[PDB]
Write a protein that binds this ligand. Structure first.
Ligand SMILES: CC(C)S(=O)(=O)NC[C@H](C)c1ccc(-c2ccc([C@@H](C)CNS(=O)(=O)C(C)C)cc2)cc1
Ligand SMILES: N[C@@H](Cn1cc(F)c(=O)[nH]c1=O)C(=O)O
Ligand SMILES: N[C@@H](Cn1cc(F)c(=O)[nH]c1=O)C(=O)O
Lengths: 48, 87, 280, 73, 48, 44, 46
């Protein structure tokens, strides 16, 4: 899967409040997370 | 025809109509009509099925589902105050 | 007439999946019909039959209600000390001498400025009261901090926020669930009392009907603000398959058309009301 | 993207695609001004003091003009 | 989607006792459902 | 009488002036707000 | 200073008082209005 590197700068990439009870790319939320999802959509790849 | 009569009677004719159409025309060209006072009564539009229809209950459930999901409100805003030209 | 045993409207515990309250009393056959301010919901409609609704409402926001004022209390004093200080300098000067004359000029410019400031600020103050609002919109209220806000422990208001997938309401529910100390109250009276005793630090989210009612009741210190969050209505509920369902429904809309329901609403809301006159 | 990436051009095209579709603006509003917690007569008590300074000062000048006036003889 | 034939909402003539409009189309089976600004009345709730 | 007509014109002038001050100050107290000095980068 | 002339000075004073007060008030209102955002500026409104 495509490895995406990003940085923990709010509010671009943030740890979800319940990140401890979560795993994978569900741990993160933010502008760049949603942007990563959209880029994945229009380029047609899975990402990590 | 009623609204046209309002516009062409120059204040000599008032039109009694459901609040919905009133609010709609209030937002429409040439924005020369106005809703005045409160309402005379309070009722609502509903979807009607022939009694004993196999469609009745799911349609009803669908209506209140849409109401709670904000769908009906969103549509109301869509056709009334979004396309409204004087809002 | 009987009062619901557990004093609840009705819901299913997400574990036991048992209905409580009036709906519970209907489903489990403890009562034959429910006539109360029972809000019509999807899940309730799934287990009982609702008559056409007899009263319309919506979830709304309740807050605590909110001549020498234009000019600060310190300056009214300063005006007096300046008054005696000018009268004392003039007393020290004693047609007229030119210096004594210029004193009157500076003092004239001073009082000109004072009265102009009073007039302008009073103009703002009078324009502002009709115009002024702490928070008008629901989203704005959600955005505001230090003014905590909450709902009843059980009912459609709380469940509306729990289920709502719409941005602002989702944010508000996310806030309420984590809020400390708890922002939820057990009775409407408790919520309104909390509004009155938080001095504007707490807003209460409740159906428009109760809000409008309390707005008219002593000591008339609460206010309904903004519009409504959603729009729904109370209905008379029958156990589904009841022999009373259709005639009760027909009776409800009969009463609605005969002006009976409007008459009862005015009777108990705005006739016994002790105070809705806003004046810009 | 690492230069020479098989992902470079489609990612770029995707970015400007999202920009033109209003997606980027919508996201900006979503994380900036939607989750924003601060969004946005009484009396002026201090300002009048500024006039008092010119008042008292003028009075002081007047006091002086008074003294010198009575001082001509 | 079909537009009601006589362009009326509905009522019963007190002589013919026939329903007109969309209610009429429902009662007499000319349509399967009515989705319109149809105001809820007592007499209509009695037949649909 | 020249001094009188002067006093009249000047009176109308100062009347307009103070009226404008009062009105504009009323608009200024009814609307807008100022908090920060707006300090230029070079000034900082 | 005839009494009739005196009442003239009083009524005329009240008159000009009303006038300058109205001019001030209305000018203040006009300036307050201008502070309010124009309808034209909004796109949806345009
Ligand atoms: C649960 C929701 C589906 S809902 O509340 O039923 N409808 C949502 C929608 C916004 C709405 C909300 C409220 C009402 C509504 C309108 C009027 C009344 C009273 C005055 C009379 N009821 S009636 O049915 O119109 C009458 C002819 C008897 C009671 C409720 C009508 C429609
Ligand atoms: N909606 C009504 C018919 N109807 C339509 C209108 F446009 C109006 O102003 N009044 C009215 O009664 C019905 O259902 O019969
Ligand atoms: N009426 C609701 C319960 N209920 C009562 C209130 F007074 C209120 O403010 N909110 C609410 O959900 C229901 O039917 O569950």
């Amino acid at each position: 899967t495509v490895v995406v590197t990003t940085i923990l700068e709010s509010p671009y990439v943030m740890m979800k409040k319940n990140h401890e009870m979560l795993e994978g790319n569900e741990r993160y939320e933010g502008y760049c997370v949603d942007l990563a999802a959209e880029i994945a959509k229009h380029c047609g790849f899975k990402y990590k | 025809e009623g609204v046209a009569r309002v516009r062409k009677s120059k204040g000599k004719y008032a039109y009694l109509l459901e609040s919905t159409m009133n609010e709609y025309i209030e937002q429409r060209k040439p924005c020369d009509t106005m809703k005045v006072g409160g309402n005379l009564d309070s009722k609502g539009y509903g979807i009607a099925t022939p009694k004993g229809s196999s469609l009745g209950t799911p349609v009803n459930l669908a209506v209140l589902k849409l109401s709670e999901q904000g769908v009906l409100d969103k549509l109301k805003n869509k056709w009334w105050y979004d396309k409204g030209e004087c809002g | 007439l009987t009062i619901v045993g557990d004093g609840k409207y009705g819901a299913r515990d997400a574990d036991t999946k048992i209905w409580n309250g009036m709906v519970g009393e209907l489903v489990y056959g403890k009562a034959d019909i429910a006539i109360a301010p029972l809000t019509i919901t999807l899940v309730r409609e799934e287990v009982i039959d609702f008559s056409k609704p007899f009263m319309s409402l919506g979830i709304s926001i309740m807050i605590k209600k909110p001549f020498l004022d234009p000019l600060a209390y310190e300056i009214w004093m300063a005006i007096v000390f300046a008054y005696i200080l000018v009268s004392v300098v003039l007393f020290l000067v004693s047609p007229r001498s030119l210096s004594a004359r210029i004193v009157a000029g500076v003092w004239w410019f001073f009082t000109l400025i004072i009265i102009s400031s009073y007039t302008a600020n009073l103009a703002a103050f009078l324009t502002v009261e009709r115009m002024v609002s702490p928070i008008e919109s629901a989203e704005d209220l959600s955005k505001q901090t230090e003014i905590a806000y909450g709902t009843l422990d059980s009912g459609s208001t709380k469940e509306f926020f729990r289920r709502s997938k719409i941005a602002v309401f989702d944010k508000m529910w996310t806030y309420m669930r984590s809020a400390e100390p708890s922002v939820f109250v057990r009775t409407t009276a408790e919520g309104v009392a909390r509004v009155r005793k938080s001095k504007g630090k707490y807003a209460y989210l409740l159906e428009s009907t109760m809000n409008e009612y309390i707005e008219q009741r002593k000591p008339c210190d609460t206010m309904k603000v903004g519009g409504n969050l959603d729009s729904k209505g109370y209905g008379i509920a029958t156990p589904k398959g009841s022999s009373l369902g259709t005639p009760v429904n027909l009776a409800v809309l009969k009463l609605s058309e005969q002006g009976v329901l409007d008459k009862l609403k005015n009777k108990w809301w705005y006739d016994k009301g002790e105070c809705g006159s806003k004046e810009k | 993207t690492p230069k020479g990436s098989s992902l470079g051009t489609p990612v770029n095209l995707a970015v400007l695609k999202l920009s033109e579709q209003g997606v980027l603006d919508k996201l900006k509003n979503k994380w900036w001004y939607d989750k924003g917690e601060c969004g946005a007569s009484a009396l002026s008590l201090s300002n009048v003091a500024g006039v008092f300074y010119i008042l008292v000062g003028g009075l002081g000048l007047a006091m002086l003009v008074a003294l010198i006036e009575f001082a001509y003889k």
